[PDB]
A paper describes a structure:
[name] crystallized in orthorhombic space group P212121 with a unit cell dimension of 67 × 90 × 153 Å and two molecules per asymmetric unit (AU). Phases were determined using the anomalous sulfur signal of the merged datasets and HKL2MAP, the graphical interface for SHELX C/D/E. The obtained phases combined with the given sequence and a few placed α-helices in the density with COOT were sufficient enough for phenix autobuild to almost completely build the structure of [name]. Interestingly, [name] contains two large loops connecting the helices, a big hook-shaped loop (lp1, aa 136–169) between helices αB and αC at the top of the tail domain and an additional loop (lp2, aa 202–215) dividing helix αC. In [name], the tip of the coiled-coil, predicted as hydrophobic transmembrane region is not resolved in our crystal structure, however, secondary structure predictions for this region suggest a continuation of the coiled-coil. Interestingly, in the case of XaxB the tongue is formed by an amphipathic helix, while [name] does not contain such motif. Comparing the structure of [name] with that of its pore conformation (see below) suggests that [name] is already in its extended conformation as soluble monomer. The neck and head domains of [name] are also arranged similarly to the crystal structure, however, the coiled-coil is twisted by 15 Å and interacts with helices αB and αC of the adjacent XaxB. [name] alone has the tendency to form small aggregates by interacting with its head domain. Since the short hydrophobic region of the head domain resides inside the membrane in the pore complex, we believe that the clustering of [name] monomers is caused by mild hydrophobic interactions of these regions. Interestingly, the protein was not incorporated into the liposomes and no larger structures could be observed on the vesicles. This indicates that albeit the hydrophobic tip of the head domain, [name] cannot spontaneously insert blank membranes in vitro. Importantly, YaxA does not contain the hook-shaped loop (lp1), which is a prominent feature of [name].
Numbering used by the authors: 41 to 258, 287 to 405
Write the structure that this text describes.
């Protein structure tokens, strides 16, 4: 399928790296490297809120993955059931002569079993009569459409919380990735280095004055020399503080670049997985809508044509479900290795 093992690997790597991040105020303050900053966007409270949101998203991924795997198994089983039963029914109806195929209608077969053909629904209930089989299959297809829709909603909500958009409940959610980008831009466009350079230039001029005074005198100049010494001491303490803060901000920018890279890699994978589940949901909806065209008054030839149209998408559905199962097994084994 279009969703590869590398895609799931990228998603799981993003989840792991996001779980390695701290989510408490003290842990956030230790990670960012400061307890306070003059920049309101980089305040520790906002950073802690963003980290906590990322942490909750990473926690939600496990439930999303489980839902995807469980519904893929269910779709493979339901597709095998529907395909095999429908093929048996179609072959049995095709074996009878053309004259009965044209004169008889579907209703002439609904009240009796079609040559020991049986169908078991999602509630483990068995149906033997053809009409009961068709109604049970219709209900199963509707329920599988609902379940596939729920899984697609889960995957879409995960991806939208990552990149941004309107969630399933109508809530407008700003993506965690653009928020990471905004914070990184705040880290990269500030005047910390400017203040550092200005203070350092003042200190260098005063140090040149101190050097010249020391070289030249050894009374009024002595007091000026000591005044310059005290001024240099104060400005140097300020420079040390601001230099530590600026180094922390620069390193945090690097860390946020890494977070952004991981989020970007996960985004493509989520796009692929969402597309695959949407394709399967569309095929199931096509099957349900075609089943809506079945009635007892139809001739056996028309019924065979319509029922072929009904059960055709389930072949692709079960193929895609088996592909998802295989890719998940391979990717999880490779991640455990």
């Amino acid at each position: 399928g279009i969703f590869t093992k590398g895609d799931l690997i990228n998603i799981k790597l993003y989840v792991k790296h996001s779980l390695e991040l701290p989510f408490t105020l003290e842990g956030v303050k230790e990670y960012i490297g400061y307890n306070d900053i003059d920049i309101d966007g980089l305040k520790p409270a906002k950073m802690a809120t963003l980290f906590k949101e990322i942490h909750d998203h990473a926690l939600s991924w496990s439930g999303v993955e489980s839902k995807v795997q469980q519904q893929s198994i269910d779709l493979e089983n339901a597709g095998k059931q529907i395909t095999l039963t429908g093929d048996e029914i179609i072959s049995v109806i095709d074996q009878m002569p053309i004259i009965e195929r044209v004169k008889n209608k579907l209703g002439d077969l609904t009240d009796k079993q079609l040559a020991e053909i049986t169908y078991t629904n999602d509630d483990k209930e068995i149906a033997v009569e053809l009409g009961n089989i068709l109604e049970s299959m219709k209900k199963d297809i509707k329920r599988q459409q609902e379940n596939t829709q729920k899984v697609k909603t889960a995957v879409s909500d995960f991806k939208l919380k990552l990149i941004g958009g309107e969630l399933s409940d109508g809530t407008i959610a700003q993506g965690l990735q653009p928020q990471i980008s905004s914070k990184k831009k705040l880290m990269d466009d500030n005047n910390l280095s400017t203040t550092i350079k200005d203070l350092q230039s003042k200190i260098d001029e005063k140090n040149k004055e101190i050097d010249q005074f020391q070289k030249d005198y050894n009374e009024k100049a002595r007091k000026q020399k000591n005044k310059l010494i005290d001024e240099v001491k104060d400005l140097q303490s300020q420079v040390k503080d601001k230099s530590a803060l600026q180094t922390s901000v620069q390193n945090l920018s690097l860390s946020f670049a890494g977070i952004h890279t991981s989020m970007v890699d996960a985004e493509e994978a989520l796009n692929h997985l969402d597309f695959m589940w949407n394709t399967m949901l569309t095929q199931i909806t096509t099957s349900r809508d075609k089943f809506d065209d079945i009635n007892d008054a139809l001739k056996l030839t028309s019924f065979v044509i319509a029922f072929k149209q009904v059960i055709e998408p389930w072949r692709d559905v079960q193929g895609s479900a088996a592909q998802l199962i295989q890719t998940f097994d391979e990717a999880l084994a490779e991640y455990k290795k």
